[PDB]
Amino acid sequence: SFKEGERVLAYHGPLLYEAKVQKSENKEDEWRYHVHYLGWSKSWDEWVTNDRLLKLTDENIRKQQELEKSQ
Amino acid sequence: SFKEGERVLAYHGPLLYEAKVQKSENKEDEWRYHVHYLGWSKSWDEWVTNDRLLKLTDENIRKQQELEKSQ
């Protein structure tokens, strides 16, 4: 699971954006994460589930790049 | 982390009692567990943190036994 302060990749629409986890919570055997999209307004901060996020690894950054290159 | 429905050992005072996890929640990087002590009044159902609980393993059951014998 993702930790508070952790930088991640996050979908917002079909592209991946760098984000930071502000809060992590689990109820009913499900994680939710309140994320801030880096360089975006705080108005876009929101709760998301695991399926919206990727660990900030070079492997997942390559996924970000592939999506950028295929437009 | 313990799961809903899981039987555990729980301190209530210095002895260990079998209990069941009713609900598990995590906030601020901390699990809490709402437990029912088996055979006890529902009045005693309560939220506890990890320090109050032990996995139902043979080693921890042996700890329960040791505490009973040193009573």
Numbering used by the authors:
A (entry chain B), B (entry chain A): 10 to 80
The authors write:
MRG family proteins contain a chromodomain at the N-terminal and an MRG domain at the C-terminal end. As a “Royal Family” member, the N-terminal chromodomain functions as a histone reader that specifically recognizes methylated histone markers. MRG2 and MRG702 have been reported to be involved in floral transition, a highly regulated process in plant development between the vegetative stage and reproductive stage. Herein, we study the binding specificities of the chromodomains of MRG701 (the homologue of MRG702 in rice) and MRG1 (the homologue of MRG2 in Arabidopsis). Both the MRG701 chromodomain (MRG701CD) and the MRG1 chromodomain (MRG1CD) specifically bind to H3K36me3 and H3K4me3.
